[PDB]
Design an enzyme around this catalytic site. Structure first.
Site, short mmCIF file in Angstrom:
data_model
loop_
_atom_site.label_atom_id
_atom_site.label_comp_id
_atom_site.label_asym_id
_atom_site.label_seq_id
_atom_site.Cartn_x
_atom_site.Cartn_y
_atom_site.Cartn_z
N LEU A 2 -13.89 -13.33 24.76
CA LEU A 2 -13.90 -11.97 24.56
C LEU A 2 -14.62 -11.24 25.09
CD1 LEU A 2 -12.98 -13.08 21.26
CD2 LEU A 2 -11.61 -12.34 22.55
N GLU A 39 -15.98 -10.49 28.19
CA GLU A 39 -15.48 -10.31 29.10
C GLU A 39 -14.92 -8.72 29.06
OE1 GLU A 39 -15.01 -13.43 31.67
OE2 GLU A 39 -15.45 -12.33 33.23
N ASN A 41 4.33 2.57 20.22
CA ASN A 41 6.02 2.39 19.91
C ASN A 41 6.85 3.37 20.17
OD1 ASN A 41 6.12 0.39 17.99
ND2 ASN A 41 6.58 1.30 16.42
N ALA A 94 0.63 -0.82 0.06
CA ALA A 94 0.50 0.00 -0.22
C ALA A 94 1.11 1.05 -0.06
CB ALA A 94 -1.48 0.10 0.84
N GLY A 98 0.96 1.93 8.70
CA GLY A 98 1.53 1.32 7.73
C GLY A 98 -0.30 1.35 6.78
N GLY A 99 0.05 1.47 5.64
CA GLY A 99 -0.96 2.45 4.25
C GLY A 99 -2.13 0.25 4.37
N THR A 100 -1.13 -0.87 5.08
CA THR A 100 -1.57 -1.60 4.88
C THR A 100 -2.62 -2.12 5.80
OG1 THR A 100 -0.55 -3.46 3.15
CG2 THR A 100 -1.82 -4.72 4.86
N1 LIG Z 1 6.15 -2.62 16.99
C1 LIG Z 1 6.42 -2.95 16.33
N2 LIG Z 1 6.28 -1.39 14.54
C2 LIG Z 1 5.87 -1.54 14.14
C3 LIG Z 1 6.89 -2.91 13.39
N3 LIG Z 1 6.79 -3.03 11.69
C4 LIG Z 1 6.61 -1.98 11.27
N4 LIG Z 1 6.17 -1.30 12.63
C5 LIG Z 1 5.05 0.07 12.96
O1 LIG Z 1 4.16 0.03 11.69
C6 LIG Z 1 4.40 1.65 10.82
C7 LIG Z 1 4.15 1.55 10.02
O2 LIG Z 1 3.47 0.43 9.20
P1 LIG Z 1 3.59 -1.50 8.89
O3 LIG Z 1 2.99 -1.81 8.39
O4 LIG Z 1 5.19 -1.05 8.04
O5 LIG Z 1 3.03 -0.90 7.23
P2 LIG Z 1 2.56 -1.91 6.32
O6 LIG Z 1 1.04 -2.43 6.81
O7 LIG Z 1 2.85 -3.60 6.11
O8 LIG Z 1 1.42 -1.15 4.84
P3 LIG Z 1 2.09 -0.88 3.74
O9 LIG Z 1 2.46 0.27 3.49
O10 LIG Z 1 1.51 -1.53 3.09
O11 LIG Z 1 3.85 -1.64 3.82
C8 LIG Z 1 6.29 2.53 11.95
O12 LIG Z 1 5.80 3.32 12.08
C9 LIG Z 1 6.42 1.24 12.63
O13 LIG Z 1 7.09 1.78 13.40
C10 LIG Z 1 7.02 -4.53 14.49
O14 LIG Z 1 7.67 -5.76 13.43
N5 LIG Z 1 6.93 -3.87 15.46
#
Ligand SMILES: Nc1nc2c(ncn2[C@@H]2O[C@H](COP(=O)(O)OP(=O)(O)OP(=O)(O)O)[C@@H](O)[C@H]2O)c(=O)[nH]1
Ligand SMILES: Nc1ncnc2c1ncn2[C@@H]1O[C@H](COP(=O)(O)OP(=O)(O)CP(=O)(O)O)[C@@H](O)[C@H]1O
Ligand SMILES: Nc1nc2c(ncn2[C@@H]2O[C@H](COP(=O)(O)OP(=O)(O)O)[C@@H](O)[C@H]2O)c(=O)[nH]1
Ligand SMILES: [Ca+2]
Ligand SMILES: [Ca+2]
Ligand SMILES: [Ca+2]
Ligand SMILES: [Mg+2]
Ligand SMILES: [Mg+2]
Ligand SMILES: [Mg+2]
Lengths: 345, 436, 54, 423
Positions: free
Chosen positions: B252, B254, B206, B99, B143-145
């Site tokens: 769930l 509860e 985070n 995404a 993240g986009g996804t």
């Molecule tokens: N705690 C933790 N945070 C993560 C991890 N991987 C990514 N993040 C956080 O997630 C955010 C980015 O979202 P992602 O999950 O990497 O993106 P996505 O869901 O794969 O969606 P795309 O855009 O398609 O890649 C950032 O703010 C990262 O800090 C992880 O393994 N552990």
């Protein structure tokens, strides 16, 4: 090179502090909306505490204590004193006070009247005073009916009026004592060595609010003897202490200052668990203004606490420098005028 | 016995899920090949651990999980990982192009082409459940996804499973480990469309996890592996009641009953203690670990509960803990802490104790401890996270910065202000409940 | 002060301590939004191709 | 495998493109024969982004060489890594472009563009997941500038959902071949504004100054200038060619770097730049990385504000110290970063350093100060256009004066757009 922002242009105290910081050549002022700051001189109302301490690689300090309004509000202070076991309702240095909500809106109307009738039946002095946090509107009367009707005409508070105040001579006039207290990020309590007495220029009459209210603005507007005795109706500790020795054969430290220091510690230590930033992602310090009343028996009474006080003109330079020394430079070192009120954390 | 299905979306969801199921296997004694020696009922059973694991005729305990990502790289780690034998290939769903940190891309453009496939795979696991309680969804806000596709999935799940509960484990964006500038956009967009479809969501900032790893584990520059190990411990404590014999948070439903009186305010604050470096210890008592539950430095989201109000509070202990010690610690805490409940709620705690001490991945950064606690408290102070997120949204959106990326995917500009208005209303609700 | 609902088992126990008494869119609608977004993408792409054709 | 298709057009594009493939082939351990002789698996982990794999474990660059003259491409084929390029990917004419944008874009280039698109189509069809295209060219000539932008326009028509990225060399009177370069550059810039997602603005004026003022080269040559570009191009593509989390592909880079579609022209920087065995500390890399003297666009960053910044650190170094130094730069100079894009600086670290350096830093900045570059081109353009000087070279190819007027207005609009966001 530390950075800071200014969000309260009306603060005379921190305008000098900001000026002093720039004069050091090691502090740079940023825009009021720039988040990459070390120090925030925040605004009085709705300070965004929730956005502090979230900047990586930045130690952030703010000049206010979140939750300190409980001590700096008329209604809040009364509720804090009564409900806090550290202070209890049997507090001896705080005038009997009651919180009264207007009828057009808990409330202590019935409780206030119960004590009022006891004084009337007992022949004791039954003069009370009504005020609120929305005033410049204060009514002083010996009849409970007038006090309640006036409030109904925001939340007000009614407390016993000190009918036997200490009167300075010559003049037979009333006064109040203002003390400045600084609490740093470690919650050390520093009392400025220099206080001021905002005295009334009119003789006290127990039978016109000019001689009963010690406000500087009122004395400079509704008083025809403004500046007659002392410059600006402000008597500093050096003169007041000399008067006590000559008139009452005692010192300011023994007669008054000991009680003032006791009151300051009790209030600040009471709320320490609620406002301390010891283990918080941001640090807080704040300058407080305590207003005290002294009766003819040399007993000190607490009137109110100001969260954003102003300083005396002559004392601006010294106090503001002390703020930078112990409150700002202690957290951000560069390249005593206070009395430390020791306590248990 | 009622089953739970775990759904992991995006890189953050998949990697966190991988760490959690690794911890689940260690806690339940399940080997990487799926064999569970302590499970005497071969090929079946309705035990507590069966809510998360199904059983084959050969004795393999297969997690009831679905892994979804619009990119194949992250899920390929699981396909060739240590626990690759646990999951059959139908559980791992991967696209080709992700995404691109764009909510609209994950929700409208790319999500539309894979949404039906994910539901069909989810339907397969649902058909194996005698009684399905609901789903646990792991994803990131930024993240986009994780943002875009999760919101689409939540909408469809409410349609196909209208009677099932849905719980969220959401990763709140932090610049110290963030990968995109538009994460505030995706966070608010996904919260707006998921708010009505989620019954209880546990936010993990985070920033808080990052600082805990540095402060308490002496990790100079924590990695995702360090963060996920700590996160899986918190998740394990939360889901432990579903997987082990007990009487608190046994299903769930509860969680909503005990933690969420107001449906919109469904973001409990999680606080965990103790976190002890393995390289380093004086074991902490019940009182000490319980008192640490009211230190902001141990919370999953940095905020100050002293300046909010509590609606509910659960204490989840693991290790050598007896009820007598818990009550003594609580009595002392009340006399030193500012704990204000709302007037329309009782001032109390729901306590659950599991005698088994917390499990730690061998060779990990967390040291073994005799007793630990996770506190789930619904405090209005967590709204500070919304205020920070909304402010960043306002700054960029005032200039329309990056908005063209979302419009180019078919999303309308009005949805931005619609989502922002929803967040403004959410902030107002928190202030009404927690502020006089 | 008060401990209620004490349940004990082999793996642990749970209870409650009280200190003070108190004082969705349908599938049709989802598809319409998704198809509406897809249509806007096609319109925007068609305009680009029209611009490139000129 | 998210493949990228590389295209180099014209004399400048092919000479710089050839050096670029030489540099990254060394980093990935690919010899001139296409055989891999590296010692680390990180080299081959994302090798598919730029290289196709053929029979015999050979790695063939996914590059297309375009020119309207054969001279420069003959040199490339006879150069160090000439044999590594796919022979069918050499697409060239004979006539030339005469440093004339009209010839490259309308008359001479139009005759050759279709055969170029055939090679592009062949390369794209064999891609599992095509990220997009990267083009190397100059804006002052005829083939790279004129035919290059024509290729971009036609590539976008056939691949509208792919990222278009260019390394564009901006002309300068200091290092100049003909007086019509402002004409060619102004016409090309409007094409780039509409039809590219990311453009690294490389200014020959800045390259010459760095060679002269900093590297102490009294008589810099094009080869010396191309040395800086090769190193800069390797640095900017580091996040694309090695495993990482930040800006790992063209689209994610664009999302982080382009807050507004037309403002996608980046200032690249490189560090260190030494005229040589001394170790460079992390604080020294950061200061030099953000130093204007290390910028490639000949624009003063303090004259504008940074919309977004991408930083790449290469080599074995303390990542904790990298975070500290990057935060220090932002906090000590927060006035130069726009406050309405929070956390607009992203930092990436790669363990494999460039050849001959223990560590290095690459700077990619989207600054409003880039408007100075377009102001300079606009002033030179107007100085001639107001007298219609040298226009006959273009009217002879069918162009009208109106098209020049529109290009002039478009670039002035681009300057104005940067100005509003700088306040
Ligand atoms: N705690 C933790 N945070 C993560 C991890 N991987 C990514 N993040 C956080 O997630 C955010 C980015 O979202 P992602 O999950 O990497 O993106 P996505 O869901 O794969 O969606 P795309 O855009 O398609 O890649 C950032 O703010 C990262 O800090 C992880 O393994 N552990
Ligand atoms: N209970 C009481 N007994 C005696 N005098 C009292 C009193 N309450 C108020 N006063 C008088 O009224 C004055 C003003 O009261 P108060 O402190 O509420 O005003 P204010 O809030 O405008 C002062 P500031 O804001 O500068 O601290 C006091 O300085 C004192 O002289
Ligand atoms: N940096 C660099 N610039 C070049 C090189 N060759 C030509 N140029 C510049 O490119 C412009 C001329 O474009 P050129 O590539 O020769 O024309 P083309 O072959 O028709 O595309 C002039 O401004 C030159 O300064 C080179 O090898 N390196
Ligand atoms: Ca079984
Ligand atoms: Ca529902
Ligand atoms: Ca011809
Ligand atoms: Mg006052
Ligand atoms: Mg991803
Ligand atoms: Mg030439």
């Amino acid at each position: 090179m530390y950075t800071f922002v200014v969000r309260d242009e009306n603060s005379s105290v921190y305008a000098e502090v900001s000026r002093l910081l720039l004069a050091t050549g090691q502090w740079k002022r940023l825009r009021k909306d720039n988040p990459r700051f070390n120090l925030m001189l925040g605004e009085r109302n709705r300070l965004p505490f929730g956005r502090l301490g979230h900047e990586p690689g930045l130690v952030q300090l703010v000049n206010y204590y979140r939750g300190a309004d409980k001590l700096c509000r008329k209604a809040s202070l009364v509720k804090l004193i009564k409900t806090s076991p550290e202070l209890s309702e049997s507090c001896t240095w705080f005038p009997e006070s009651y919180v009264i909500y207007p009828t057009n809106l808990t409330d202590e109307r019935e409780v206030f009247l119960a004590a009022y009738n006891r004084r009337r039946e007992g022949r004791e002095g039954n003069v009370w005073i009504a005020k609120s946090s929305a005033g410049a509107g204060i009514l002083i009367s010996s009849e409970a009916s007038e006090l309640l009707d006036f409030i109904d005409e925001q939340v007000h508070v009614i407390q016993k009026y000190l009918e036997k105040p200490l009167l300075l001579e010559p003049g037979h006039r009333k006064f109040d004592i203002r003390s400045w207290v600084l609490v740093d990020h470690l919650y050390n309590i520093y009392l400025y060595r220099e206080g001021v007495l905002r005295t009334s220029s009119e003789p006290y009459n127990s039978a016109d609010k000019t001689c009963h209210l010690t406000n500087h603005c009122i004395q400079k507007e509704y008083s025809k003897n403004y500046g007659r005795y002392e410059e600006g109706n402000e008597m500093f500790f050096e003169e007041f202490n000399q008067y006590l020795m000559d008139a009452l054969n005692t010192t300011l430290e023994n007669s008054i200052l000991l009680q003032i220091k006791h009151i300051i510690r009790s209030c600040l230590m009471c709320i320490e668990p609620a406002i301390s930033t010891k283990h918080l992602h941001y640090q807080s310090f704040q300058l407080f203004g305590f207003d005290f009343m002294v009766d003819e028996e040399l007993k000190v009474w607490l009137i109110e606490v100001n969260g954003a006080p102003a300083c005396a003109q002559k004392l601006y330079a010294e106090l503001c420098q002390g703020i930078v020394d112990v409150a700002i430079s202690s957290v951000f070192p560069l390249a005593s005028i206070f009395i430390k009120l020791h306590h248990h954390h | 016995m009622r089953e739970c299905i775990s759904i992991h979306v995006g890189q953050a969801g998949v990697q966190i899920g991988n760490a959690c199921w690794e911890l689940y296997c260690l806690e339940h004694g399940i080997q990487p090949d799926g064999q569970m020696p302590s499970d005497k009922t071969i090929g079946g059973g309705d035990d507590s651990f069966n809510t998360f694991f199904s059983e084959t005729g050969a004795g393999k305990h297969v997690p009831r999980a679905v892994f979804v990502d619009l990119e194949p790289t992250v899920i390929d780690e699981v396909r060739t990982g240590t626990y690759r034998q646990l999951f059959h290939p139908e559980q791992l769903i991967t696209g080709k192009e992700d995404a691109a940190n764009n909510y609209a891309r994950g929700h409208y453009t790319i999500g539309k082409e894979i949404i039906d496939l994910v539901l069909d795979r989810i339907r397969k696991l649902a058909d194996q459940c005698t009684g399905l309680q609901g789903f646990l969804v792991f994803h990131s806000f930024g993240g986009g996804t994780g943002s875009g596709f999760t919101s689409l999935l939540m909408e469809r799940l409410s349609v196909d499973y209208g009677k099932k509960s849905k719980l969220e484990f959401s990763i709140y964006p932090a610049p110290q480990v963030s990968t995109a500038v538009v994460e505030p956009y995706n966070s608010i967009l996904t919260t707006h469309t998921t708010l009505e479809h989620s019954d209880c969501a546990f936010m993990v900032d985070n920033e808080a996890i990052y600082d805990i790893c540095r402060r308490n584990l002496d990790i100079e520059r924590p990695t995702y592996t360090n963060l996920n190990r700590l996160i899986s411990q918190i998740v394990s404590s939360i889901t432990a009641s579903l997987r082990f014999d007990g009487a608190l948070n046994v299903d769930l439903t509860e969680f909503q009953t005990n933690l969420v009186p107001y449906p919109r305010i469904h973001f409990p604050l999680a606080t965990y203690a103790p976190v002890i470096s393995a390289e380093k210890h004086e074991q902490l008592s019940v009182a000490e670990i319980t008192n640490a539950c009211f230190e902001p430095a141990n919370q999953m989201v940095k905020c100050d509960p002293r300046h909010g109000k509590y609606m509910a509070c659960c204490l989840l202990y693991r290790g050598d803990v007896v009820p007598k010690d818990v009550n003594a610690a609580i009595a002392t805490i009340k006399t030193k802490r500012s704990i204000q409940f709302v007037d329309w709620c009782p001032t109390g705690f729901k306590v659950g104790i599991n005698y088994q001490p917390p499990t730690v991945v061998p060779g990990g950064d967390l040291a073994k401890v005799q007793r630990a606690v996770c506190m789930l408290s619904n405090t209005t102070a967590i709204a500070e996270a919304w205020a920070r997120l909304d402010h960043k949204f306002d700054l960029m959106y005032a200039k329309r910065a990056f908005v063209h990326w979302y419009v180019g995917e078919g999303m309308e500009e009005g949805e931005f202000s619609e989502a922002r208005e929803d967040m403004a209303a959410l902030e107002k609700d928190y202030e009404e409940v927690g502020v006089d | 002060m008060e401990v209620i609902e004490l349940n004990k088992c082999t793996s642990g126990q749970s209870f409650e301590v009280i200190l003070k008494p108190p004082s969705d869119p349908s599938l049709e609608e989802i598809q319409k939004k998704l198809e509406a977004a897809e249509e806007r993408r096609k319109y925007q792409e068609a305009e680009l191709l029209k611009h490139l054709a000129e | 495998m998210r493949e990228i298709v590389h295209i180099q057009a014209g004399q400048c594009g092919n000479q710089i493109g050839a050096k670029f493939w030489e540099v990254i082939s060394d980093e990935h351990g690919i010899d001139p024969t296409g055989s891999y002789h590296g010692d680390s698996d990180l080299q081959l982990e994302r090798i598919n982004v730029y290289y196709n794999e053929a029979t015999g474990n050979k790695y063939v660059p996914r590059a297309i060489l375009v020119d309207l003259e054969p001279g420069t491409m003959d040199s490339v084929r006879s150069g160090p890594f000439g044999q590594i390029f796919r022979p069918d990917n050499f697409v060239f004419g004979q006539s030339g472009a005469g440093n004339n944008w009209a010839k490259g874009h309308y008359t001479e280039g139009a005759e050759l563009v279709d055969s170029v698109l055939d090679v592009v189509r062949k390369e794209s069809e064999s891609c599992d997941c095509l990220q997009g295209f990267q083009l190397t060219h100059s804006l002052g000539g005829g083939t790279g500038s004129g035919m290059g932008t024509l290729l971009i326009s036609k590539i976008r028509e056939e691949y509208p959902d792919r990222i278009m990225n260019t390394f564009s060399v901006m002309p300068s009177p200091k290092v100049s071949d003909t007086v019509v370069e402002p004409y060619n550059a102004t016409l090309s810039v409007h094409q780039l504004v509409e039809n590219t997602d990311e453009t690294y603005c490389i200014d020959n004026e800045a390259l010459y100054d760095i060679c002269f003022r900093t590297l102490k080269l009294t008589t810099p040559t094009y080869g010396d200038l191309n040395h800086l570009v090769s190193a800069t191009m390797s640095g900017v593509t580091t996040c694309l060619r090695f495993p990482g989390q930040l800006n790992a592909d063209l689209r994610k880079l664009a999302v982080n770097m382009v807050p507004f579609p037309r403002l996608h022209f980046f200032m690249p920087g490189f560090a260190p730049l030494t005229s040589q065995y001394r170790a460079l500390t992390v604080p020294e890399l950061t200061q030099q990385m953000f130093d204007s003297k290390n910028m490639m666009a000949a624009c003063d960053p303090r004259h504008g504000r940074y919309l977004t910044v991408a930083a790449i650190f290469r080599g074995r170094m303390s990542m904790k110290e990298v975070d500290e130094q990057m935060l220090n730069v932002q906090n000590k100079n927060s006035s130069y970063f726009v406050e309405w894009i929070p956390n607009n600086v992203k930092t990436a670290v790669c363990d494999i350093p460039p050849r001959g350096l223990k560590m290095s830093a690459t700077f990619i900045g989207n600054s409003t100060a880039i408007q100075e570059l377009f102001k300079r081109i606009s002033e030179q353009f107007t100085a001639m256009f107001r007298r219609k000087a040298f226009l006959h070279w273009y009217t002879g190819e069918g162009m009208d004066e109106m098209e020049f007027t529109e290009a002039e207005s478009n670039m002035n609009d681009l300057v104005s757009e940067y100005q509003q966001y700088q306040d």
